[PDB]
Structure formats: C-alpha cells, structure tokens
Symmetry: D2
Subunit: 420 residues, 4 copies
C-alpha cells in the first residue's frame, strides 16, 4: 500500500507549515514555537495567560495516542495558565514519544507549538492534491472535517466533492466560490473561503508542493474561517530549486543511516530481517524481497543506488549495510542498465578489501558490462561468491544466512568459496 | 537390549555346526552341503530320492519368513524327488534373501543343507549356556521345543528346568539322567538323552563355545532322539586358540567394511545417521550416541579402536569412516587411558593429510597425554577443530553436520576453522 | 457485574431529567421536547434558527454509536437551520434505534430533545451518589468530564475527588466551595458551582434519587457553568411516595412482558435459553441459573414472585412464562419462607388446569407448608412432576427440555408422569 | 461378506462328521467321543495308551487360539498316556472356551474327540462344494493343505485346481484319477485317492450337503491317505428330508433366543445396538439396518418372519424382542407381499395388549392389505405409533430410542402418542 519503497517525501513539522501559511496571508490562529519552558511561559503570557493549546512536533502517524517517557497521554494538551503550560512543556521537550508506528524506537519531541485555542462551529475538510486521474491539481472538499476522511469517503462517496483545475489558466475565484458553496459554507463567509483557497493554491504552486491538506478547515464562533491543521507533503524531486523548504528538513526524525544514505543519493529501506541486499531500482528491490520471502528468508536492510552512481557511492552503500549488525548475508543484486555494472564490481572489490567484509557477499551482476565486471571479480581473487540466476541467488543467500547464524550458535568460524 | 555394540559373536552356518555335532558322535540326521544343484541331485538320490528337506544357509534372524529375489517363501523346503530338489535349489543358490532383519541389504544364500526328513514325536528344547547367575555352564531343558521359548519361559517359568554344573568336577551322567527325567523323557530312551547331553557338553568345553542351543531336540518315531537344530554361539575372545572353528568364519554375511575393520582389530558399528565418530571403548560409544541423539543428530557409523592400537590402526579407522559417503561430520571422541592419546593425534594428522579429509573433524582428545596431542595438533596446522567439552563437542558436531548438509543443498563450499 | 437481577431502577428520558433540573433552578441550556418535525421547526426558529443540537430520547447503553432503520449514525446531530432540523428529525421520530445493547430488538425513538449548542471551555465530571462505603450521599468530582470516567478513575485514582456528606446536618455551602476548589474551578465562578451543587443536592434529596451524574459539567465560553448531561438513576422502592416521577415512566422501552410483570409486582428476567423457571428470591434465581448451566442447560426467562404474593400473582406468572414460545420445560423452584408454599401449589394447580400447560412442570416445593402443598398436588391428580432435591430437579428439568426438543424434531407427542 | 443374515447353515461337531465319513467307508483315523474323563481313559488305553490326540468339540472360528476358563491354550492337545489324557480332559469337558469370535460369550465344550495321532507326509487340501459359477458341484484340490487356503489361492490362483461335475451322469472314476494326478499324488496311491473322492461325493449327494472340506487330506507315513478334518456345511432347506442329520443338531452352541426363534420358523439376528426391529425379508432387514445406522442409531436384535406366518408367529416374535433388555425402541417394518399385513396388525394388537409392551412401537405397515391393518390399529386404540415413510420411520424410531434412554437417565416416565 502507498509507496514507501520509492522516496520518502519531505514532511515538515507542524510549526514550519503553519509559518508558511502565515507568510502567505492565509487566515490562521496565532502560533509560536517553544524550545524550552521559558519561552513557552513568555508566549502563554503574551497570548493572554489563558486558553492556550500545546502541540508536540513529532513526525509520526500516531500523535494523539502516543506516550511519552514521562508518562503523558497524547501530543496535544489544553492549558489555561502559563505555569501549567511550563509544567506540561517540561514533560514534552527533550522527551521520547512512543507511538504504534515507532513501537519502541520513538522520535524525540524537540520543540512544541504554542497556539491560541479557538472553538470551531463547523468542521470542513479540504485538500489541494496533485493527482494523475485528473492530470493535475485537484481541490477536494467536504463537510466532514476533524474525523478520519477515508471512512466517510468510502461509505459516502457523494459527500466528497472533487474539482480539477486547469494549470495554464491557473485557478479562478469563481471556481473557489463554487467549491465553497458546494461544500455548504454559510453564504456570508464564502468570500473568505475563496480567498483562503486562492492563497493556498498560490502557496501550492510556489513551494513545489504535492498535497496541502487542511483538516479541519473550521469556521470560528465569529466567522473568519481559520485553518487548524496544515499537513503538507512536498515533492522529493523539487530539492534543486526549493532550497528554503528543503534546508529546514528535520533529520532527527530518521535514523542516522538514513541521513548518511541521503547524503550520497542512496535510497535506504530498513526492515526486520537478517539478509542485507544492495539493489538497483525499486522494482527489483521488491522483486528481491518477494523472492527472499519465498525461500523462507527475510531481508534486513536493502538499498537503491539509483542510476549512474560513482564507485564511492557503492562503497558508502556497503559501509551502510555493514554498519548494521543484524545483517548476516549480503547479496548485491544489480542488473545492468543506466548503472554501469563494472563500477559496482570495482566497488565490491574495494569495499570488501577495505572494510574487511567477512560476511558472504552473494553477488549477481549483469547488464551492459558483464565481461568487465566478471573479469575484475576474478582478478581480485576473493570470496566474492558469483551467481547469475535470480532464483539460484536467492536460494544461495538464504541458505548462507542460515549457515552463518548456525555457525555463530556453534561458536565456530567458516569461510565460503565457489565450488571448484 | 542384548549386547550388539560389544563384539559380534561368531555364528556359523547350520551345516558347519551339524558337522561339528556329527564328528562328536551326537545322534544327528544325515546331512550334506550343496553348492550347486548337481550335487544336490547326487545327495538326494543318495538318501533315497524321496523325503528330503532343503535348508538355506543364511545368517539372519528371519529364515522361514524371508523372501528370495526369485520369489520363494521361506528358507526351508520339503522335496520328494531329486528333480524338484534341483528345481528349488536353483532358486536358492546364488540368490539374495530378503528378511526383515536385513530389510533391503539381504545376505546371499551361498550353499544349502540337504537332509533327511524325520517325523518328530515329541519336541524338547535344550541348551548348554555359559551364564553369570550360576557362575558357569547351565543345562536348560524343557518340553516346549519347536516353538519360541521366551514366551513359554515368561508365562510358565516352572516349565523351564535349569541345572548348573560344577566345572572342576566336570559333568556327571547322573546329572544328565536327572535332567532327562525332569523334562519328561520316555523311560526307555533316557540313557540316549544322557549320552547326547554328555557329548554335547564335551563339545561345549572343547570348542570354547558359549551357547549350544538344540531346538528342538526331538524323539523320532522309532526312538533314538535326534537333534534338529544346533545353534552355536561361540566366544569372540577364543580366536587365538580355536583356529579351526574361527577359520571357517563366513565373511560374505557382513559388509566389506566390517571385514576390513576385523582385519585390524577395530570394532565397527554402522547406523542410519550422518555423523561419523571414532570412539575409544564401547561405553563412551553409547555415551556419544546418546548425546548426539539429544542434540537432534544421529550417528552414522562409529568405531572402537580398543586399547594400545598403533597409529596405522587409527589411519585405517579414518579410511573406514571416510569410505562411507553417508557421513558428513566426523568427531574423534577418545578419552585417554590405555589408548595413548598422542598416537591418535598423530593418526589424525596423517589421515587428514593423506586421504584429503575435507569434512569437519570435531576432535576431542584427553587423557594421559594432552600436552603432546594438542602440541602435535597445533604444529600440524590444519582445520583440526579442537574441542574439550563432551556436550560442547556434541553440539558443535551436530551443528557442523547441519551446516555441511545445508551448504551441499546451496551448492556452495565451506571451510571450518577455530575462532581466533 | 452490577445488579441486573435485583430490580430495574427507573431511568427517565433525557428531557424529563433536564426539565427536573430546570424547575430546581439549576443552570441549564435551553431545551425542549419534539414529537414531530413541525414543533422541531417551531423550536429551532424560536432558538434563533441556527446552532441547534438534536438528541435522541432512547434508553440504551449505546446512543452515539447506534444505528437507525433509516440509516443514520448516532443519536446526536448538529443542525444549523430549522429545515435540516426537520429533515433529520424525520429520520429519528418513529424510527427504531439499533445499538449493541439491543443487538436486534432496538427501542423506538419516540421523541427528541432540541437544545441550544454551547461551546464548552473546560469539562468537569460530577456526581451525587448514595453509597454504602461512606454510609450516605457522596459528592464525586473530577476535571475529566466528557470522557468515560472509569478508565481515568482506575489509572489515576487521585484525580477523582470524593467527599461524603452528613445527612442530618444537610449539605453546607463551604463544602461545595471546597469541592469546587479541589476540582480546579476558576476562582471567579466557584460561587456558581457551589449554588449548582446545592440545588442538585436539594433535588437529590427531594425526588428520592439514588445517583445524579452530571457528565460533563462544563464552564461556558462566558462563565456561568452549565450542565450538559443529567443522568439520574432513581430508587425503585420510592414508588409509593414519589408519584410524579414514577408516573412519567416510559413503558415502550421494555418488553410488554416486563410491563405485565411490573403490573403485578413480579420481577422478570428474560434470557436466551429454553428452560423457563419460577423462583422465589433473587439469590435462589442465580442459584437455579448456575445449576442449570452446570448440567448443560440454559434458562429461558425466569421470574421472582417476591414475598406474600397472592395466588393470582403466580397464575399471572405462569401465564407470563407460557406466553413466550422459546420456553420448553418449566421448573417452579420456590423454597418456603415468607412466600407460603401452599398458595404456590394452588397456583400451579389452577394455572395448569386453566391455560392447558402441557409442558413438563418440574416443581420443587418446600418450606413452612410442605404437607399442604404436596397434599394439594396429589389431590389435583395431574402431570405435576414433583421433585425435592435441587440438583436432582435441575438434572430432571434439563433432561426434560432435551426430551421435549427431541420429540418436537421427531414430530411425535409425549406425556410425562412420575415413576410408579 | 459371506451371507450371515440369510440362514445359519447347520454345522455339526467334528465327531459327528467323522462318524459320517466312517460309515461311508472313507479312510479315516480311528476316533471316538468322550463325555467324561473315564471313557477318555478307556479309549486311550484302547488305542494303545500312547500317541493320542484330544480335540475340543466347539463350533467357533477360532479353536487352536481359544482359551478355556481353566487356563489352557487351544482346543487340540497331544497326550502320550491315558492319565494325562484324563488330566487334560478334566480341563476341557464342562469348561467354557473363550475365542475372539465369541469374545466373552464363549461356547461350552460338552464333549471331546479322542483320536489316534498319525504323522502326515504330504498335506493336500480338497473340497466338494456346490457353486453357481459351475452350476453344480465342484471338486477343488490343491497341494497346500494344513494352511489357510485363501492366501495361497489369491497369491497363486494356478495351484488351486477346480473341476466341475455333471450331475445327471454322476461322477466318473476317471475324473477322480485326473484330479489326483493334477494335484500331484504319488503314482502308487492314486487309486485310493480316487476311491476316497468317490465315497466323499456319494456322501455329498446322499446327505444333501453343500460343502465337504477335507483340510488337510494327508498321505500317511505308510500310504493309505487319511482325512484329518472333515468340515461339512449342510443345507438349511434340506431339513424336511434329512431327519437323521438335522436331529443331531447341537443347540447349546446358540443362544436360547435363537433356539426359540428356530422353533417357530423365524430368522433372528442379534447385534450390539439398542433399537429392536421386526422385518419381513432379509433384504429389507439390511435396508433397515443401513437406514438406522445413517441416522446415528444402531439396531439391537431384529427378526425375519418369513412368508405366510401365522399371528402366533409374530406374537412369539414380539415376545422374543421384548425378552432382551438391551432393546429400547421397537419398529415393526414389514412391507406387504406374501406376508399378509393384516395378520401382523392383529399380532401387534395382541402382543402389545398381552405382554404389556410399554416401549415405543414405531410400526410401518404396507402392502396387499393396508385398509384392514390400519383399521385394526385404529380400532384397538393404543400407543401403536403409526408411520408410513421409511426414512421418516427410521428418524422417528432413532429419536424415540434417544428419548427413552434419556428419560431413563432422568428417572422419569414417558408415554408416546401420535400428534393430534
């Protein structure tokens, strides 16, 4: 489901997206960022010392059901005095949040968002998303905000209004009024909704975004609709020309291995197995995972070197797989194409020679240079276990993983070589 | 049950024991040996060309229930003309007998026994056996011959008469009359029974026998009791001074590996496992089997080098284990004592160097010379996988057997070495 | 768990309790009752034609998760115009609500409650309950309203403030201020909370109530704390002197059998079995249920005739068990005491004679009159199957139920009589 | 397998058939009958006081594997003095033989057969049997006597010689010589075999026999072939004209119920169930058994009244089923035909009225008189539970058996009647 394997789209913390909406002129509750209880106190007394909401800036699927190490329920709190605001913030900042998505490797709440608490009258869901069905941006709107939207979308498909937009002519205000009036806005604040949607679409086109979800867009108790949440999924490919947004990327929310892989343009996918891999292209990565799971194995943490990567890239790759200790047997399964196989053969030679890779490297190299790669493998004269059949390679690597974990139990050492 | 592991007592073919009884003067039906149908014809016409019995000379537990490759039931047949005697003998000589004891590796019927057929009137079981309970020879007699004797012995212990004998004063004829009259002999042929028992005891003491079982000793239709079967279990230790009996040992009834082992004074025990061994003493052999079966393994074919054997003996031993292909991992588990451990270390060095023993040799050497053995193992500088704990050695060897059979499946080669 | 078997405490519809709070002077949102969409329209336009809440008046454990036959989710709705108020009310009034407590025999929503929608700022739970631990009324208060209170009470027992009250000296305002300030009220509206609690306690003592639960007591966005829900569990025994409250009892929420049983002072307990009963006292009723479930049976619908009931009461009882068709075998298990057993014997005689009770009546009568009861049973001369051992009676009745359901399958008729 | 249900062919004791062979002139070992140890002594001393065989006269499938109450193995013994002959006979006469066919209801050994013991030289099987395949008597001969013949017949069909005979021209001596020479008789005693077969065929035709099995026909140690066993299965239908043979029928070998049934020309079949029956014709008897076993029941002991039986016959029948106590529910399942159904209706009326048949009689009467039978059933006015569908009748009777055994457990009494 979803993509997962292909790219990890940049998700910002809540306060960054809230600031981005603020600078764009979108109507928004007053909000600030707190790194310590002191400025939390300062902002709480600045907003009136009463009726304040505190939100945790943690990137996870579960944020209201998570648990802190201090023993607090959820990531959102409602405080009514700056003193209790400091008290609760002292239990969030510097604390590790345990949610079901993390399980046990929870992310740490570095900052918090301090906002004014506003009472919503009606709850609308809204979302500007790029999509292939309508060959472009789509404005989705509904009057079922504040609640999970997939359930009502599946049970009541009519209630989810979807309107496409023509990109070359841009967005027209009449379209925004049409969407607002089809959702069911009050006839006195439709203009504000149209202005908010126009500003949101301008932000959507400017920052190279992919999906701006406002859930829920809520009318206040005194009109002047205000957005509550501003989830933004950006585009990974837009790193080259969107420097401001991508520089603010939070790196604490991912493993240091992920950061190192991204430093060299290598996709990384960790897992719960004990058979490392090194695969060219996501498709053959899922293929390798499926074929390993067929033979009773389970991949541990496998990579994706992209196309045209240098030898240093695959050297860093092998460093990255060998960094994890849960790995037992590594297979480099790269078929040829854009990624010139000879540089991978050179990279395996260099990486096995340097980092002392004693684990069984079940290589399987093909494509656009087979003579050079195999010739280099033979010239290097190592335990580089050559193979040339995908099913045979998977069988061999799974059996080698079992052999390694068995010999570790037996407290004996083994060395693997091709049959004569 | 029984001994099995310790020594394989010499069991002769039926015709040899029948001849031995004949030369001792024991009353016996006329019998001859046939190697081909031609002399079977000659003997059948010699005995009257009618009322003849043919017996198969195969050493197995099942002889009347076995099957030939030609498709004949049982090893005994009753022929009434020399022509049908030739016909049935052509289906016995040169044919392979399939019994449940053999299962599929049946022994070949080399010769047959041609005897006159006599109608028994009463069936007595009789047996002169050495035993520890009565500290010497024991004459066992009963009137339940021709039928398996353990069942009636267990159900009716009174019916099995047992009489001990004092060796220095020999056997007395009065004792033989007492035994005959307690079995229930007719009062007219008791003297013949006493003479037969005296002759049998003389044969028992002469040929260094251990158990002479006559089952069934039968009175004929005209008196003059005649023995039908003459099973004789001899003594293995009596080879030095009983040359005539032990030279007539049939070697076709055992595997060629057994013959080779006996040629060098090595006990051999084949099995259905895939972990070879090499054990000093039967007791530690059962210990090794039990400890291997504890860890899920199963020994394949393990030996017993006795005491004080030369280095050539253990070289031949390792040749013998490596001869079998069903073996995967070999453990030499010799503790010290009479068998000087240093000669075994020298033997493993020489045998691994010569026969190219690539299988994992999980050695475990101790006793009366540990410094010399370990020093020689270290000086030789091989894959001689040293170990010094019995449970650890069994764990290691079972895991190595699993590793070997797994790598054979994976079609990859491995080399085993001690952890650094 | 709970009581269930002993008494069904009178639970009023929401609007009746809301009116009771209104007449007592308790601060309360404006609310009205609608029986048809027309007055729903009238009240909606009366309250401002906007920001209105509609609640279903159904007595069930699940009210926000239930389903209507029309296909609407939950019993609460938020409407913003009188027209959509009429539209939603047309899908509530006259409709049958399906909740998990009912399963399939859902209660019908006869009326609805139309109220003004107010935005709560803080949510407090509060409850005046009679209890034995504190030998009287207890004021329970907490700052975790709007959410199920058992979870937070068990996980955080400190957060649930409990304060007892001395009945003879009444409640003191200082106690109300103490409770308000220990919950954490704002220091400007503590007086209003104290006045509300005093009025609620006066209502609690007046109407012979047992538990008044305000969940959640919420401060408004402009002070002047207003109660949202006003659950009231009354006292069954207080029917004699509380006529106004008990006359307003809604009878549609229970089976007509329950209404008929209450018309004659008989406790009724329906079930999912097929062995009817008729038991004196709740304790022996649970005893009979347990002993029937021991023998593999399951009681169908069993009663409780109380003490000193007339013969007409037990005649109506037997009419009531025989009314249900799911019953197969009926056991009257009354032990003596206050309930004079002879009148039950007369009642069984009359009821079996009149209503033609052909089902096996496994009677078991004892206590304070055994001679008269058994004499009357014998004089009447029927199939009144006498028994005098509790375990034997349960065995007999379970076996008779099996016999009856088996003979119904066989399409044959049976008649049961005591062994001669 | 076999017939079982249809007729119990008269099997005589061994000594009667041996005498029958003796009077016919068939060569036979000398034999006598002993009822007490005294004449056993007399005969043993008459035959030479030595070499005597004792056989038990018990009609069962297992005779050499059975057990006596005294604790003796098998029914055959070999004695060599009249004193031990008396001793063993004292453990046979008056003793109850336990074989697997009987299980626990073993037959009692009333007499024994004392015979001379002869040593067989060759063992031939022989049998004159009526059969439909060859439309008459068949002489079967083989040279595999003394051993079970079905195994060798199935494995080696060629070895079983079968020769048919033309009845009108009788048997010809040339045919007997042909059979003897095809079995493999010695060429000097073929004439004796032919004479024996001619005499056996004369006996076969005279006594209206069906199968005369000589197993094994054995040549003696001095020629003059002598028959050992002389099993004779006679014809049930030949009772009218074979008075001498059928008068000697032993009745102790069957249950007294079987004797009573045979006294009135009723077939009886006891079983291990608890649903009695009363069926016209064997075919519908197997049909009723199969249909009862389909519905989870098991018939107890069911009958066969033949054709044209009087009312007294079915009265005795019902007496016979009701005699057994293991029966619970009785079904009379007679379809019309030769057996006039009205007499069965009269018989059920009389038998239920007389013997006080309180068990549920699930009648199912049809055929050639339905008006009279049903009219009589209705006029008698009883609990005669009428039914008219075979599957419905089986369902009803199985359910009634379950109801009866359930009410017996409940210690309550029931009465069954047709639904109104």
């Amino acid at each position: 489901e979803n993509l997962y394997f292909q790219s990890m789209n940049l998700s910002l913390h809540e306060y960054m997206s809230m600031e981005l909406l603020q600078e764009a002129g979108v109507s928004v509750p007053k909000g600030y960022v707190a790194k310590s209880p002191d400025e939390a106190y300062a902002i709480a007394k600045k907003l009136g010392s009463k009726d304040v909401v505190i939100k945790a800036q943690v990137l996870a699927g579960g944020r209201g059901k998570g648990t802190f190490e201090s023993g607090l329920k959820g990531g959102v709190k409602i405080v009514f005095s700056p003193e209790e605001a400091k008290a609760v913030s002292s239990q969030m900042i510097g604390k590790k949040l345990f949610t079901k998505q993390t399980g046990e490797k929870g992310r740490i709440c570095n900052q918090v968002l301090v906002c004014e608490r506003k009472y919503p009258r009606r709850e609308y869901y809204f979302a500007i998303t790029m999509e292939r069905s309508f060959q472009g941006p789509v404005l989705i709107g509904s009057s079922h905000g504040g609640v999970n939207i997939e359930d009502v979308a599946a049970e009541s498909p009519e209630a989810i209004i979807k309107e496409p937009i023509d990109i070359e002519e841009g967005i027209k205000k009449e379209q925004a009024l049409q969407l607002a009036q089809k959702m069911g806005f009050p006839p006195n604040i439709v203009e504000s909704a149209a202005e908010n949607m126009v500003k949101l679409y301008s932000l959507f086109l400017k920052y190279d975004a992919t999906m701006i979800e406002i859930n829920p867009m809520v009318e206040d108790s005194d009109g002047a609709v205000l957005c509550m949440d501003a989830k933004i999924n950006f585009d990974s490919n837009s790193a080259y020309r969107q420097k401001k947004i991508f520089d603010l990327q939070d790196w604490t929310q991912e493993d240091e291995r992920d950061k190192d892989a991204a430093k060299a343009n290598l996709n990384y996918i960790g897992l719960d197995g004990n058979i490392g891999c090194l695969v060219n292209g996501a498709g053959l990565a899922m293929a390798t995972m499926d074929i390993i799971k067929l033979h009773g194995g389970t991949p541990a943490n496998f990579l994706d070197v992209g196309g045209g990567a240098t030898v240093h890239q695959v050297t860093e790759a092998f460093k990255l797989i060998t960094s994890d200790k849960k790995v037992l047997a590594i297979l480099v399964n790269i078929f040829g194409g854009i990624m010139r196989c000879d540089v991978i053969a050179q990279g395996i030679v260099m990486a096995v020679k340097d980092l002392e890779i004693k684990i069984p490297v079940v290589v399987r190299l093909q494509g656009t240079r087979v003579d050079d790669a195999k010739a280099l493998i033979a010239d290097s004269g190592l335990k580089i276990l050559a193979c040339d059949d995908l099913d045979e390679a998977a069988r061999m690597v799974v059996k080698l993983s079992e052999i390694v974990t068995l010999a570790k139990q037996a407290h004996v050492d083994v060395k693997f070589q091709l049959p004569i």
